[PDB]
């Protein structure tokens, strides 16, 4: 009877482990029974509790394949099935109240951000993300990394690159599993190269060179080169060739964001070092891009803050700064201040540890 | 998929359409609370109107969303103040948890309010709508015929 | 519930004591410098 309760539970976990294509024959047919299994004498008990005996991951694996819409087949106004999942996951979400829930709770948020990333709208993300903070000391190294990956994706549409760079770089330094070195690793790399492109600071893909397929690399190089050399012409023809690629990965958003960046990168390489830079040169470069908006674009260029310049067109010179800092006041001290904060948090962990 | 059909009717003109919108929203508030959280000032303006009579329903919807935010105390006021939207007589995750909080609120207060005045419970000092929910908790307890619970909450 | 009160009590004694550890620790810092100086 003690044994009976326990025996049901061990059986429920066991059925969940088996069904990743062993003694199985249709993940979707079986879903009904998996929902059935989950909720009595398991999901029910845990009301103020969280564990790694309850795991969204097992159910995630199951649910993910159905969302290729090949079992739905787009015969229908909306999926029922995803709505059901979402209803049920949100039902857990209530139960969590940030007292001991950070564990399983965090997976549900990964799932929720994924559905927005497939085809929803990513403005709803903001609250979940905030709710979802509370000291994290029970989430696994792979889980941290996936969450960051999804979070980074959110940030990028919202036009927040720096924040996304920090998270993706922090992600790849979790996960000693050899199972997240496989295709997942490739996806992660993709996103780190995209963020590098957006900032437009972009280094060469050297590091990536012995950790991706040479097939992946060459197109990936092609994009980076397009930005770096600073041609619109080069960039457009690279988009044209590797159309299937940018579509496939779903990082088609680049084509909007990057175009304005590419043209700016192209002025930047042309030097702005001395007290005046003659107007004719800068006009010449721009003339190739567009010669009806040479004043409008240079003005916009300055406004952005990427580069900064002064123009007289009653002298017809463009006046510029070095683009090199000074050390004589608070701004290097602010870097000193960030570093000491980082050290203290780290110190607190070593002592605790 | 979207709460957007519903939310559109919540801002549309005529009282009737807004009454329908409240009840349309109502059914699925819990799942979609995130989106509906932005529309809270609008919902709150119905509540404050004492000419519009589905004020209570707008309040109820506000409470669910505040709960999901972390503002448990705020929603507890708002359900009482609606004047029917506090019902313990149903059994829910919403209801159980905000009742847990309500007792906590009265007990904390009850420490302070005894020290000033030892007749407070006897009186309007802690408002009747709160005192009723607490008094019903006592009755709930007594029915289960395990006295240590009833006496506990009251002590 | 008579049990819950009791358990809350046990925990409370414990709390006063967790602050108490800290207060002896602060004190020891002062005495450590003075001793090292003395030598």
């Amino acid at each position: 009877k003690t044994i009976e309760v326990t025996a049901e539970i061990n059986c429920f976990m066991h059925l969940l482990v088996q069904l990743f294509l062993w003694d199985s024959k249709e993940l979707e047919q079986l879903v009904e029974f998996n929902r059935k299994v989950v909720i009595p004498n398991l999901l029910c008990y845990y009301n103020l509790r969280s564990l790694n005996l309850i795991n969204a991951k097992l159910w995630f694996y199951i649910y993910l394949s159905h969302e290729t819409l090949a079992r739905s087949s787009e015969e229908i106004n909306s999926d029922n099935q995803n709505i059901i999942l979402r209803s049920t996951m949100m039902k857990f979400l209530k139960i969590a109240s940030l007292k001991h829930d950070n564990e399983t709770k965090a997976m549900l948020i990964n799932l929720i951000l994924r559905d927005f990333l497939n085809n929803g709208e990513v403005d709803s993300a903001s609250d979940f993300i905030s709710k979802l903070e509370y000291p994290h000391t029970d989430v696994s190294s792979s889980l941290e990394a996936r969450y960051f990956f999804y979070l980074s994706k959110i940030n990028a549409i919202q036009l927040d690159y720096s924040t996304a760079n920090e998270y993706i770089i922090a992600a790849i330094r979790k996960a000693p599993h050899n199972s997240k070195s496989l295709g997942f690793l490739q996806q992660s790399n993709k996103l780190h190269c995209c963020i590098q492109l957006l900032m437009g600071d972009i280094p060469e893909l050297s590091f990536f060179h012995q950790s991706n397929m040479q097939k992946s690399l060459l197109p990936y190089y092609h994009l980076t080169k397009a930005v770096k050399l600073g041609d619109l012409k080069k960039f457009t023809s690279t988009i044209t060739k590797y159309k299937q690629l940018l579509l496939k990965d779903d990082t088609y958003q680049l084509c909007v964001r990057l175009r304005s960046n590419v043209i700016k990168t192209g002025i930047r390489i042309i030097s702005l070092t001395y007290k005046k830079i003659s107007l004719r040169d800068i006009c010449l470069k721009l003339n190739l891009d567009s010669e009806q908006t040479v004043e409008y674009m240079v003005s916009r260029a300055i406004r952005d803050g990427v580069i900064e310049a002064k123009i007289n067109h009653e002298d017809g010179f463009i006046e510029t700064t070095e683009l090199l800092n000074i050390y004589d006041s608070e701004d290097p001290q602010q870097v000193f201040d960030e570093r000491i904060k980082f050290a203290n948090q780290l110190h607190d962990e070593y002592l605790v540890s | 998929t979207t709460a957007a059909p519903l939310l559109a009717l919540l801002r549309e003109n005529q009282d009737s359409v807004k009454t329908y919108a409240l009840e349309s929203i109502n059914n699925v508030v819990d799942q979609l609370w995130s989106e509906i959280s932005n529309e809270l000032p609008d919902i709150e303006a119905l509540y404050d109107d004492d000419t519009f009579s589905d004020r209570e329903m707008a309040a109820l919807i506000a409470s669910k969303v505040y709960y999901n935010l972390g503002e448990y105390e705020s929603a507890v006021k708002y359900a009482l103040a609606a004047k029917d939207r506090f019902d313990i007589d149903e059994k829910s995750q919403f209801v159980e948890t905000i009742v847990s909080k309500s007792i906590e609120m009265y007990v904390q207060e009850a420490s302070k309010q005894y020290t000033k005045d030892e007749q407070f419970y006897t009186k309007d000092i802690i408002d009747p709508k709160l005192t009723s929910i607490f008094e019903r908790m006592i009755e709930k307890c007594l029915k289960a015929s395990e006295l240590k619970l009833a006496l506990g909450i009251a002590l | 519930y008579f049990k819950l009160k009791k358990l809350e009590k046990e925990y409370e004694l414990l709390t006063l004591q967790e602050d108490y550890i800290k207060d002896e620790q602060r004190h020891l810092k002062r005495e450590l410098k003075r001793a090292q100086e003395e030598v």
């Binding site: 007292k99 | 948890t97 847990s100 | 519930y1 819950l4 809350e8 925990y11 550890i21 020891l28």
Partner: peptide, 28 residues
């Protein structure tokens, strides 16, 4: 009742961090 369980739980969490400090206090 549920709320009373939660108050106790948070005390249990704080203690472990103290235990690691009970060790540090002894070294001083």
């Amino acid at each position: 009742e549920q709320k009373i369980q939660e108050t106790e739980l948070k005390i249990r969490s704080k203690t472990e961090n103290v235990r690691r400090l009970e060790a540090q206090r002894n070294a001083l």
